[PDB]
PDB file of C-alpha atoms and ligand atoms in Angstrom:
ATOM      1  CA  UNK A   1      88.846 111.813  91.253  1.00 26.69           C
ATOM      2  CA  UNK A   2      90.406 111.360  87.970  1.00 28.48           C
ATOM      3  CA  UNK A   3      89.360 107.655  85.777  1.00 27.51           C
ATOM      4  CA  UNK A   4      90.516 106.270  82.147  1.00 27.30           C
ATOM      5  CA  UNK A   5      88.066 107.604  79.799  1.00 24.85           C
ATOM      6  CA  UNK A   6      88.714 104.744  76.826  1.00 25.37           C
ATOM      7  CA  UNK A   7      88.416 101.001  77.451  1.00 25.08           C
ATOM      8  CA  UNK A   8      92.023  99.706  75.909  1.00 20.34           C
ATOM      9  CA  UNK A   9      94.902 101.120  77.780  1.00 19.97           C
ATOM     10  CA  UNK A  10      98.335 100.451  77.349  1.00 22.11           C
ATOM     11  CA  UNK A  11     100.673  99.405  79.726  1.00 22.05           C
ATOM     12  CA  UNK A  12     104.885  99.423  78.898  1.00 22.53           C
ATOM     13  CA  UNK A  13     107.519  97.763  81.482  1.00 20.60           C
ATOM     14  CA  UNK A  14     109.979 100.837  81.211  1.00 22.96           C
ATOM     15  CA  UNK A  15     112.920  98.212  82.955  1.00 28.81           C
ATOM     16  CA  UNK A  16     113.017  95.237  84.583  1.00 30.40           C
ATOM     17  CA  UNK A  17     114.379  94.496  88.187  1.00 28.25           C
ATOM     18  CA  UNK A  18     116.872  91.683  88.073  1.00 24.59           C
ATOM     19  CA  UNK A  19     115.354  90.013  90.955  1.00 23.79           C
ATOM     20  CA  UNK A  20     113.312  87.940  88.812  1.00 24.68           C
ATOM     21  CA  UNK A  21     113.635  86.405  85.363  1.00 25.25           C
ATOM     22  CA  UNK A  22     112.020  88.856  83.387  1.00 22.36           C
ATOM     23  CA  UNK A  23     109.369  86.418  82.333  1.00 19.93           C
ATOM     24  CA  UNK A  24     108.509  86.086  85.269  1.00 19.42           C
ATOM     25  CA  UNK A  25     107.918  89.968  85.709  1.00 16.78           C
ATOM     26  CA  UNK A  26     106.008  90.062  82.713  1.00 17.06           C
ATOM     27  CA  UNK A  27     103.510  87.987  83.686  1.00 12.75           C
ATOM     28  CA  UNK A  28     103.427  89.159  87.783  1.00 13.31           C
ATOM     29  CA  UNK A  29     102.351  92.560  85.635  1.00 14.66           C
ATOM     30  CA  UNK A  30      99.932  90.804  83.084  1.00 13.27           C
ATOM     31  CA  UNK A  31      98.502  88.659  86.100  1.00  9.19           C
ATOM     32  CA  UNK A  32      97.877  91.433  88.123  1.00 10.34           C
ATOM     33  CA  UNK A  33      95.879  94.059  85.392  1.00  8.95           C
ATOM     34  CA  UNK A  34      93.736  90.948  84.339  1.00 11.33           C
ATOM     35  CA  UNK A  35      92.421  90.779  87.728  1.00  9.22           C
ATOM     36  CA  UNK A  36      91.163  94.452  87.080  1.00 10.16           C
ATOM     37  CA  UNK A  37      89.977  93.581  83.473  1.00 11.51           C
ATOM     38  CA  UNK A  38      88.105  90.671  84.821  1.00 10.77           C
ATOM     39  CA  UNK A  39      85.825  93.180  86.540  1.00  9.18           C
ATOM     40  CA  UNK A  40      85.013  96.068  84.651  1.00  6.76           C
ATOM     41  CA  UNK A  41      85.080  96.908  80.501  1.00  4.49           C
ATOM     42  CA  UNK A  42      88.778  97.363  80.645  1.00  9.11           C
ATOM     43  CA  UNK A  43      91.075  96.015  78.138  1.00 10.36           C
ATOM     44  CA  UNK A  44      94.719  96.163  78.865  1.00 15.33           C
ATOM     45  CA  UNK A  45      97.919  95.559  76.422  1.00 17.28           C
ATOM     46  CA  UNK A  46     101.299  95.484  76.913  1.00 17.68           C
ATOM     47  CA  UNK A  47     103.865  97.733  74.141  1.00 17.20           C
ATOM     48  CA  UNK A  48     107.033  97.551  73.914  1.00 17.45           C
ATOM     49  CA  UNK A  49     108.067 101.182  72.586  1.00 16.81           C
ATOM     50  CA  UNK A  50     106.149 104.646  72.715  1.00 15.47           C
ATOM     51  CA  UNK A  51     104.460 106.371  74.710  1.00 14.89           C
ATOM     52  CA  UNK A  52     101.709 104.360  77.280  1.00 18.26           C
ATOM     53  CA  UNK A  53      99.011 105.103  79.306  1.00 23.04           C
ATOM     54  CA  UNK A  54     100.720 102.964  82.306  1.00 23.69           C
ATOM     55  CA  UNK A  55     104.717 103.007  82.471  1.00 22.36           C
ATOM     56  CA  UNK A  56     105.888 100.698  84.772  1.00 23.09           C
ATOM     57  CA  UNK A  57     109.297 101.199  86.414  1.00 22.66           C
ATOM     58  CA  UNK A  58     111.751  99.778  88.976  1.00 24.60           C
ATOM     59  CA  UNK A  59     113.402 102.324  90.585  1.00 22.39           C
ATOM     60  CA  UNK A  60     115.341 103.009  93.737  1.00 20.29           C
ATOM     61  CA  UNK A  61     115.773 106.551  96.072  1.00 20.67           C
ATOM     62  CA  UNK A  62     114.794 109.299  94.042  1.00 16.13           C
ATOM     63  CA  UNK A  63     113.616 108.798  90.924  1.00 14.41           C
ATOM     64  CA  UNK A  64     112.879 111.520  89.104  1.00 14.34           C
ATOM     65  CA  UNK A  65     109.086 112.400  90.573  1.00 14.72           C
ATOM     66  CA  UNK A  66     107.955 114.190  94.049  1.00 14.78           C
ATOM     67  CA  UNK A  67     107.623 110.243  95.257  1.00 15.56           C
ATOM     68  CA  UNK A  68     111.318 109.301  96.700  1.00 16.26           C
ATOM     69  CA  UNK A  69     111.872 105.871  97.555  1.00 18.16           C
ATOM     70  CA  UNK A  70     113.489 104.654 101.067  1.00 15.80           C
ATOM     71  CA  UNK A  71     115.534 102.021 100.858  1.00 13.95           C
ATOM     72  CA  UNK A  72     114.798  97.787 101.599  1.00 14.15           C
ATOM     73  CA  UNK A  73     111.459  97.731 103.937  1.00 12.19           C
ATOM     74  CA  UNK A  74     108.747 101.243 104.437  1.00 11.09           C
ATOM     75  CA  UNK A  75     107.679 102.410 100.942  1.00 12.02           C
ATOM     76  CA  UNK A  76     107.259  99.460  98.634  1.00 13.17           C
ATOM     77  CA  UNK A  77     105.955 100.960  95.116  1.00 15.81           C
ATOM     78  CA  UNK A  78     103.677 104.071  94.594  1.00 16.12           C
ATOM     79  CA  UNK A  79     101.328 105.025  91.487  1.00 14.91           C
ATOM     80  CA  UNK A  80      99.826 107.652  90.088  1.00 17.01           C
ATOM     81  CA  UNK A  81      95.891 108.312  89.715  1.00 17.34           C
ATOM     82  CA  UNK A  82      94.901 108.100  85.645  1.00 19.27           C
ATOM     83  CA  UNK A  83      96.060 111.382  83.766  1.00 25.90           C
ATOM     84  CA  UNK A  84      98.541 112.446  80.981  1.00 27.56           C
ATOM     85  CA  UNK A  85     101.665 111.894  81.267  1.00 27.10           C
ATOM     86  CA  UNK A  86     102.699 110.223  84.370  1.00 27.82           C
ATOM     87  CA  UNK A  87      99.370 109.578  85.090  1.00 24.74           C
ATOM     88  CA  UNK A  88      98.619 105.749  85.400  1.00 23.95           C
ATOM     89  CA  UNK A  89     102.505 104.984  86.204  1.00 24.36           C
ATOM     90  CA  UNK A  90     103.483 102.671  88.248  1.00 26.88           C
ATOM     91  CA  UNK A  91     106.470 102.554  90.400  1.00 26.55           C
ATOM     92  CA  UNK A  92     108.433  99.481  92.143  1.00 26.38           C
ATOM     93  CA  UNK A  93     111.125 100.159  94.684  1.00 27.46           C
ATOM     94  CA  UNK A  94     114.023  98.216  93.381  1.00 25.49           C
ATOM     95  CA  UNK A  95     115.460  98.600  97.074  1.00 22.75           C
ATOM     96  CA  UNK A  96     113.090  95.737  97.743  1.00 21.67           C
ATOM     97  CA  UNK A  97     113.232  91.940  96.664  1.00 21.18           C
ATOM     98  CA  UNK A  98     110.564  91.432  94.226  1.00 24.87           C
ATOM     99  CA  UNK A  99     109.280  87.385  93.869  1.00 25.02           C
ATOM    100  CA  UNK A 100     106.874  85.613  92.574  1.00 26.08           C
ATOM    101  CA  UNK A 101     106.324  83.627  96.031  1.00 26.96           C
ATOM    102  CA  UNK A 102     105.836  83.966  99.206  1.00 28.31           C
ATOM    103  CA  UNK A 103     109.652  85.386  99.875  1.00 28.26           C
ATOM    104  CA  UNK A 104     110.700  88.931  99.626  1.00 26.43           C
ATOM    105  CA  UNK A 105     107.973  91.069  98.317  1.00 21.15           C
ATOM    106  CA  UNK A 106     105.540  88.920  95.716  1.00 22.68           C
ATOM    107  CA  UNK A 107     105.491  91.872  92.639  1.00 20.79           C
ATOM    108  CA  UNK A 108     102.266  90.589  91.655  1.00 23.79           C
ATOM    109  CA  UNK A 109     100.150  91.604  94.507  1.00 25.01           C
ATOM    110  CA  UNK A 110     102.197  94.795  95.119  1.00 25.01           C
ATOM    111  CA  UNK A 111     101.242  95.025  91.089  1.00 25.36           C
ATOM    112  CA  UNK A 112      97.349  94.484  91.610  1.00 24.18           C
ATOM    113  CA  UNK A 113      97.720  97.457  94.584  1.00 24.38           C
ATOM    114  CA  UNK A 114      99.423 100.196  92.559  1.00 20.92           C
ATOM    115  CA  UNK A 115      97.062  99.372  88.987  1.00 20.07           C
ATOM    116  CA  UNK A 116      94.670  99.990  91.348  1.00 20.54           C
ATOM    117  CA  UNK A 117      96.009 103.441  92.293  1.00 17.55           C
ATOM    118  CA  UNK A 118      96.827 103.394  88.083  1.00 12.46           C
ATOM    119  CA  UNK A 119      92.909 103.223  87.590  1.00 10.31           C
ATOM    120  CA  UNK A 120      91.723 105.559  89.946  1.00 10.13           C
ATOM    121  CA  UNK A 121      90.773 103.809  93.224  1.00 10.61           C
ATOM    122  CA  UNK A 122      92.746 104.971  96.511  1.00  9.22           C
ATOM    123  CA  UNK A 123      93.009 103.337  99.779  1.00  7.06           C
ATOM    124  CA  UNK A 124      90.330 101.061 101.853  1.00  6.19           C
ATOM    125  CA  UNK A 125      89.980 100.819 105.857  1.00  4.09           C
ATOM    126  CA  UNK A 126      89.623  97.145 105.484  1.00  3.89           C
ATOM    127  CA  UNK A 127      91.950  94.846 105.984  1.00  5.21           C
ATOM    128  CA  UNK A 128      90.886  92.396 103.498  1.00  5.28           C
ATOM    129  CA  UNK A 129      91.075  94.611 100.646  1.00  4.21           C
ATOM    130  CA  UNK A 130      93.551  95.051  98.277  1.00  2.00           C
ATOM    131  CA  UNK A 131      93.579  98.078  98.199  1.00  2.00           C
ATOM    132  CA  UNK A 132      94.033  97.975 102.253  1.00  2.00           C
ATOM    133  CA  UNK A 133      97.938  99.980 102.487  1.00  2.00           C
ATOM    134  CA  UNK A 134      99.580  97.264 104.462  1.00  2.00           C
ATOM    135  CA  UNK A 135     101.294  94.536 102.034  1.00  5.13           C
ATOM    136  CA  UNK A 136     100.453  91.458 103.377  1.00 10.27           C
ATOM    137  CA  UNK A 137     101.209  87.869 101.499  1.00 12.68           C
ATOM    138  CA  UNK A 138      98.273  85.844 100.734  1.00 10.13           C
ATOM    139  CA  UNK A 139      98.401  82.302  97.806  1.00 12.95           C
ATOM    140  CA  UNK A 140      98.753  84.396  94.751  1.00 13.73           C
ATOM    141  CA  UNK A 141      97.646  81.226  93.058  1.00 12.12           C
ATOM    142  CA  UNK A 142      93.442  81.445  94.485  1.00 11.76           C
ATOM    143  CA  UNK A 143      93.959  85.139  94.940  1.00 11.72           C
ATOM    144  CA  UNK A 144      90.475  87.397  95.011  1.00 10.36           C
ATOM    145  CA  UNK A 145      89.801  91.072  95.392  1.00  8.45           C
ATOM    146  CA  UNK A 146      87.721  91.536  98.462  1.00  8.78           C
ATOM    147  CA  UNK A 147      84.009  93.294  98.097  1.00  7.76           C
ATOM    148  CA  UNK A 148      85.025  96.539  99.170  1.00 10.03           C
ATOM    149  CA  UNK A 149      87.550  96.375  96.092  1.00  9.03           C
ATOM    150  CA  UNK A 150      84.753  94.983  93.766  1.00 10.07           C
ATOM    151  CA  UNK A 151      82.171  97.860  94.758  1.00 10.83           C
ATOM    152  CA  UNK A 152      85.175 100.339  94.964  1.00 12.92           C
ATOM    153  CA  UNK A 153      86.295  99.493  91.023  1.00 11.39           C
ATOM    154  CA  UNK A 154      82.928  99.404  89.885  1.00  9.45           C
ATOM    155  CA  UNK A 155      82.411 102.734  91.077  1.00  6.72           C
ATOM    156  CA  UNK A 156      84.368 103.819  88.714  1.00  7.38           C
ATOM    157  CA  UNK A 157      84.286 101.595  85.823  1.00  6.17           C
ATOM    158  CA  UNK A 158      81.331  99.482  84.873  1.00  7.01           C
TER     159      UNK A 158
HETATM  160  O1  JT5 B   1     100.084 102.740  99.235  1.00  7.44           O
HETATM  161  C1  JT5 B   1     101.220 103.012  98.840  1.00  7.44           C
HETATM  162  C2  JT5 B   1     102.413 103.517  99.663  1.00  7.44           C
HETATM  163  N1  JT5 B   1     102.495 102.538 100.710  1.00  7.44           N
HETATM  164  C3  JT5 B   1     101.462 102.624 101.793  1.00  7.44           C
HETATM  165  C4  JT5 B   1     101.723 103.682 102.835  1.00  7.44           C
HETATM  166  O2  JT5 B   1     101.903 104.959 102.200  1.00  7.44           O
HETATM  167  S1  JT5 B   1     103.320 101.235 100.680  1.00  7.44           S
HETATM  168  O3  JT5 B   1     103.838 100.935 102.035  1.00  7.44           O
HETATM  169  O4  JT5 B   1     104.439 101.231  99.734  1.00  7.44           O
HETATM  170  C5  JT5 B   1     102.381  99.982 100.222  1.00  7.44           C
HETATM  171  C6  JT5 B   1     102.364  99.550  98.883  1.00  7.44           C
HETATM  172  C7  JT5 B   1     101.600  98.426  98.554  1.00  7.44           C
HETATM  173  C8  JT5 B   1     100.847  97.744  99.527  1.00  7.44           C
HETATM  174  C9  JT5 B   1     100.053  96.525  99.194  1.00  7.44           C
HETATM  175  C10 JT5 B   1     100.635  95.540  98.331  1.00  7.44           C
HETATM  176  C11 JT5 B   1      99.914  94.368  97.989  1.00  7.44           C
HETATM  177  C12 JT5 B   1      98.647  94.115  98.570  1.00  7.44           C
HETATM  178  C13 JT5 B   1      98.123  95.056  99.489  1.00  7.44           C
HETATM  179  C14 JT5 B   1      98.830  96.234  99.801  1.00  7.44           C
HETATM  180  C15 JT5 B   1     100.794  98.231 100.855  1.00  7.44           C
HETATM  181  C16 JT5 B   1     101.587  99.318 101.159  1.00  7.44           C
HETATM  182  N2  JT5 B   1     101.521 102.841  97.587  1.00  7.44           N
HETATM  183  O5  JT5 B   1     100.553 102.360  96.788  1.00  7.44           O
HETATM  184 CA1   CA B   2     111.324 100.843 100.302  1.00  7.10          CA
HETATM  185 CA1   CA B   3     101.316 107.609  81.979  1.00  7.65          CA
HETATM  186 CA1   CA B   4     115.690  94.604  94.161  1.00  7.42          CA
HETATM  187 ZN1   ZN B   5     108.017 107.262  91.697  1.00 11.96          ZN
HETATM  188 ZN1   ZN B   6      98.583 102.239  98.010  1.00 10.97          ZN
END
């Protein structure tokens, strides 16, 4: 399916959950695209007005897409495959409790998921991947995409 055709993409936070500081948030987000850039010609900035390639949102029930969310627990974020317009975007159910440890949901890891959905890739069969669609908590602080992630990206990019 669909991939970025440029190397710098843009990524805006559209709002900010107020389960974190919003520092925090802004580098759960930055954390989690450079562990895309750090394997394939990518180049990712953050804006703070116009129009991006990535929007990132928090957003509870329905939101304004075909993608409803469902309340604390189930659906934790979805994204959409690269394209125009809300192609890329990213989308955080505010019904959950975002961190940036080991309690509630950790945003960055959900984060390194859904860019992965933002860049193209879709869902793996194993468990140890990333892109594997059960969110499971793992040190954010040593984390590493798996193989399958690493072949999966580069299929794409690279
Ligand atoms: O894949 C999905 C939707 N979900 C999976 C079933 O449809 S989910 O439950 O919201 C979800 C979202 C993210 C993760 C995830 C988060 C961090 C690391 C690994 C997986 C797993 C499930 N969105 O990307
Ligand atoms: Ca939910
Ligand atoms: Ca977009
Ligand atoms: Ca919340
Ligand atoms: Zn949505
Ligand atoms: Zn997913």
């Amino acid at each position: 399916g669909p991939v970025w055709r440029k190397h710098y993409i843009t990524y805006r936070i559209n709002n900010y959950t107020p389960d974190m500081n919003r520092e925090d948030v802004d580098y759960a987000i930055r954390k989690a695209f450079q562990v895309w850039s750090n394997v394939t010609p990518l180049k990712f900035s953050k804006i703070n007005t116009g129009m991006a390639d990535i929007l990132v949102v928090f957003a509870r029930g329905a939101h304004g897409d075909d993608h409803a969310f469902d309340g604390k627990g189930g659906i934790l974020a979805h994204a959409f495959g690269p394209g125009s317009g809300i192609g890329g975007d990213a989308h955080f159910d505010e019904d959950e409790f975002w961190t940036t440890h080991s309690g509630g949901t950790n945003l960055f890891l959900t984060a390194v998921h859904e860019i992965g959905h933002s860049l193209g890739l879709g869902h793996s069969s194993d468990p140890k991947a990333v892109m594997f669609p059960t969110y499971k908590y793992v040190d954010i602080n040593t984390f590493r995409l798996s193989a399958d992630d690493i072949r999966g990206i580069q299929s794409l990019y690279g």
